[PDB]
Design a protein around this ligand. Structure first.
Ligand SMILES: Nc1ncnc2c1ncn2[C@@H]1O[C@H](CSCC[C@H](N)C(=O)O)[C@@H](O)[C@H]1O
Length: 327
DNA sequence: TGGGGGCGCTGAC
DNA sequence: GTCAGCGCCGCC
């Protein structure tokens, strides 16, 4: 994550729904905002959240009375994506994990925050012939909010990961915000190899599979894209190897394959998956952030998370818009 | 709400 | 056909 000198969100309160690791919290707090409520039902996510912020998020949001949620200015929510991801079954709203947005709408209707800031996977934007996004849009408009949605790739914002996500920023209409803008892309000068840990700290992650098939030569020039170098097995998810001179593939939460949830990389002649700390860095998390003691849970948590830097630029722009109140 | 890994299909070229 | 995906499923 980056440093934010001008705290655009100072004095603003926000809630951290579907908190996970608290990526939205790091992002908004870096801009000066104050978190007044967090919600996350996963036992392990609650533990790591507590390790880093000192509070245990409240459980199952579908059972929380929206009237008991503290007043706030910005509602943050990177809601479940299994039901919308290109990697899943795409049952969408028909999925038990796909109706969480309506819980968000329920809370918004009641608390009417100034801003609603949501995130989901790229496929969310085209799911069900675009009907899914339209539904979110119409729901927000009905609740009297504007709707700004755009898919941003983390590689365009200083982080070496091809993580494409749709970000939805909504302003309550009475605020008449007409100048919100998604941050503009800039050249990437950081690649996977710049975030790796020393070899001595990741030796245990080195795997030597005799079914390894190198399909492309390593590149010596850094490039802002994923560069596949080979595969193991049939080359399915988690069985693909990439160059560290390129960018990281999208980290996942329930992913499988021998290089589960991070993908494999060629590092100093050997092939290995990423270490949880490297996952943190590829997600823009500061080294000061404490990862969960269970590596499997840590991989899952970062795989479900958000790239801090991207949210920071967006949060900064939300604040910039809110602060422009000329006479 | 465990931890590991083989998979197989979809979306967007 | 190319290829990558906050995933799925069954195993222990
Ligand atoms: N009913 C529910 N109540 C509370 N949390 C829920 C929930 N259903 C799913 N979740 C939580 O929703 C999260 C979605 S992933 C979002 C992660 C978050 N942006 C962070 O930065 O990491 C998961 O952690 C999941 O456990």
């Amino acid at each position: 994550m980056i440093e934010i000198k001008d705290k655009q969100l100072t004095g603003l309160r926000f809630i951290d729904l579907f908190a996970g690791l608290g990526g939205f919290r790091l992002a908004l707090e870096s801009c000066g905002a104050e978190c007044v409520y967090s919600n996350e039902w996963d036992k392990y996510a609650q533990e790591v959240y507590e390790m880093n912020f000192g509070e245990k998020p409240e459980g199952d949001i579908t059972q929380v009375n929206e009237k008991t949620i503290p007043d706030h200015d910005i509602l943050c929510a990177g809601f479940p994506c299994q039901a919308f991801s290109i990697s899943g079954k795409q049952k969408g709203f028909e999925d038990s994990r796909g109706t969480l947005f309506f819980d968000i709408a329920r809370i918004v209707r009641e608390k009417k925050p100034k801003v609603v800031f949501m995130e989901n996977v790229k496929n969310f934007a085209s799911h069900d012939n675009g009907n899914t996004l339209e539904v979110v849009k119409n729901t927000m408009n009905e609740l009297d909010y504007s709707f700004h949605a755009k898919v941003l790739n983390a590689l365009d914002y200083g982080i070496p990961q091809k993580r494409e996500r749709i970000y939805m920023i909504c302003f309550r209409n009475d605020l008449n915000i007409q100048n919100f803008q998604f941050p503009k892309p800039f050249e990437l000068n950081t690649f996977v190899k710049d975030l790796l840990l020393p070899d001595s700290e990741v030796e245990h992650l080195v795997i030597d599979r005799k079914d390894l098939v190198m399909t492309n030569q390593e590149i010596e020039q850094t490039t802002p894209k994923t560069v596949r170098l080979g595969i193991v097995g049939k080359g399915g998810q988690g069985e693909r190897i990439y160059s560290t001179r390129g960018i990281a593939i999208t980290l996942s939460a329930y992913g499988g394959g021998i290089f589960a949830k991070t993908g494999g990389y060629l590092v100093n002649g050997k092939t290995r998956k990423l270490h949880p700390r490297e996952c943190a860095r590829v997600m823009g998390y500061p080294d000061s952030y404490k990862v969960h003691p269970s590596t499997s849970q840590a991989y899952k948590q970062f795989g479900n998370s958000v790239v801090i830097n991207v949210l920071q630029y967006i949060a900064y722009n939300i604040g910039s818009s809110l602060n422009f109140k000329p006479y």
